[PDB]
Design an enzyme around this catalytic site. Sequence first.
Site, short mmCIF file in Angstrom:
data_model
loop_
_atom_site.label_atom_id
_atom_site.label_comp_id
_atom_site.label_asym_id
_atom_site.label_seq_id
_atom_site.Cartn_x
_atom_site.Cartn_y
_atom_site.Cartn_z
N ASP A 35 0.76 -0.70 0.00
CA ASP A 35 -0.21 -0.51 0.36
C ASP A 35 1.17 1.17 0.81
O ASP A 35 1.23 1.71 0.69
CB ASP A 35 -1.21 -0.16 1.21
CG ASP A 35 -1.81 0.87 1.28
OD1 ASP A 35 -1.87 2.09 0.16
OD2 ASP A 35 -2.65 1.14 2.35
N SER A 199 -0.51 15.66 -12.03
CA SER A 199 -0.84 15.20 -13.18
C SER A 199 -1.28 16.40 -14.29
O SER A 199 -1.48 17.75 -13.29
CB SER A 199 -2.21 13.71 -13.06
OG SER A 199 -2.16 14.30 -14.83
#
EC number: 3.4.23.22
Length: 330
Positions: A35, A199
């Site tokens: 994770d 992004s």
Amino acid sequence: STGSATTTPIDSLDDAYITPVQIGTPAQTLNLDFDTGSSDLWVFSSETTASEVDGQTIYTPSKSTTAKLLSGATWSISYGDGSSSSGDVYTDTVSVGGLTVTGQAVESAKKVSSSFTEDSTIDGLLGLAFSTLNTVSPTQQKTFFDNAKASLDSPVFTADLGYHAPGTYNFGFIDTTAYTGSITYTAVSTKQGFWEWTSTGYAVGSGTFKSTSIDGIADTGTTLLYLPATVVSAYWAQVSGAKSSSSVGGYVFPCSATLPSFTFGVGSARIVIPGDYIDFGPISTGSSSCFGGIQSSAGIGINIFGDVALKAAFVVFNGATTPTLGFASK
Ligand SMILES: N[C@H]1[C@H](O)[C@H](O)C[C@@H]1C1CCCCC1
């Protein structure tokens, strides 16, 4: 040193991925959920409330000659999906794919929430976010990666998740045969303890690319792609019959639909998520309504590039003094 381990979807939907991890002496192999969105290595154990164990493989520290109780240490964690676990702490030897860390904090669960109990395939979590998020008290502990880093050939690990297929976690090296083209690297903020990056924008199907900054985290421990409501609405608008369902808890779409791809930007580079990656199947058995793999982050507080996004890429988690993230197509 290096390590290399195969990671395997737990079910037909790629809801999560499990990776075998050797703990203790002799080795006890548990299948952990790696994770990158958390920083605790915790396991089902001989100490877990019996009624809360249902099929999981457990760690028994009393059977490990290298296990040492970390005196006075406790841990307690709650995740973004409302699940939780807690217990005490041992140090022990932990190996992943041939890479060994001695004195790793192994957090032994005394309590787990129902969602962990009900998932027989996940024996615990191995956190790979920054150690600042580790919940051990009163002395915070380091992640497996943090402990291994100085010994690694290169201070990196890579995630190569498969679509309906096994993939690979590598530690300490970049497999240049595992991706196409080049790896594009992008800046990371560690301010919130995550692999947080920005992004450069998105496209829906064959549509024009929208240049827009989207701050989010690279999180292997989250199944879906969570993005701003505007972006998610633009995506599902291209799917006939798709709609947001408050009763179901997100966008659903007719299972007869053909889903468009979703592209996200990494600098000037583009990662394309094929449409079928975004299908998470009937909302209930036999239903013709399917759950969407791209969902709104509005009620989360952060955008999450989870497995739906990451499995479309070869992803480098660069743990150099100034960490960065790398994405390549594959
Ligand atoms: N097991 C869940 C994963 O973690 C994703 O969030 C979606 C999936 C499931 C799909 C059917 C409708 C309910 C949600």
